[PDB]
Nucleic acid binder design. Structure first.
Ligand SMILES: O=C(O)CCC(=O)C(=O)O
Ligand SMILES: [Mn+2]
Length: 201
DNA sequence: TAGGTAAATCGT
DNA sequence: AACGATATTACCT
């Protein structure tokens, strides 16, 4: 197993991928992908958007979840049923049958884009797991421990892979190494990631 | 207030 | 390039 309370479900979302990508395009047509600026003033290499009741955003003051897209000043698009159903099935297979996400972050990685090591730790209810779906180009996923200097596991995530963490591993450090360039028939030149969370309640 | 918080980039 | 430091400091609440 990946870790205590963590599992990788390889190719779990492979069959659902084409529909998921159609719905990514639908979400992005309403709340476009954008590269967010950190409180410290650095632009993230990942381009992102959100769907569902809450969306992850940056302010000058820190990180926060908001029901409103600060770019459009409209609510984030509703979570697609394809997203919700896939998340439910993956969470159940991973041993979290009661997971009820209210937020889905959509990350887009161009070649060279990365996500430096971090914890998912601004959700008020840490009992709920993280469900993380990979689509398109492959990436090296780092999965560590509770401390930033804890040893990292390095796992290639390929199209359709789903990673779930929670319980003992809920606050584990993780990230994505700079994306290698390449081709995938469904995303062409990028990697998408769907990150489902219970961000409120 | 004065204790807590810095975490993406930079250096090795 | 895989790690560690970032603070023997600035910026807040
Ligand atoms: O893209 C991934 O696989 C990781 C995404 C992630 O950790 C995040 O967006 O917080
Ligand atoms: Mn994360």
């Amino acid at each position: 197993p990946l870790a205590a309370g963590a599992v990788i479900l390889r190719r779990f979302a492979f069959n659902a991928a084409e529909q998921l990508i159609r719905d990514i395009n639908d979400v992005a047509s309403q709340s476009p992908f954008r590269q967010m600026v950190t409180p410290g003033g650095y632009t993230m290499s990942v381009a992102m958007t959100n769907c569902g009741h809450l969306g992850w955003t940056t302010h000058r003051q820190g990180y926060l979840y908001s029901p409103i897209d600060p770019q459009t000043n409209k609510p984030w698009p509703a979570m697609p049923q394809s997203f919700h159903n896939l998340c439910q099935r993956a969470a159940t297979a991973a041993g979290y049958p009661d997971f009820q996400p209210d937020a889905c972050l959509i990350n887009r990685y161009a070649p060279g884009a990365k996500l430096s090591l971090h914890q998912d730790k601004c959700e008020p209810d840490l009992r709920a797991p993280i469900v993380s779906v990979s689509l398109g180009l492959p990436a090296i996923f780092q999965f560590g421990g509770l401390k930033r200097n804890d040893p990292l596991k390095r796992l290639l995530l390929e199209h359709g892979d789903v990673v779930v963490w929670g319980g003992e591993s809920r606050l584990f450090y993780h990230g994505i190494q700079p994306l290698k360039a390449g081709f995938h028939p469904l995303t062409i030149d990028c990697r998408y990631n769907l990150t489902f969370r219970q961000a409120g309640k």
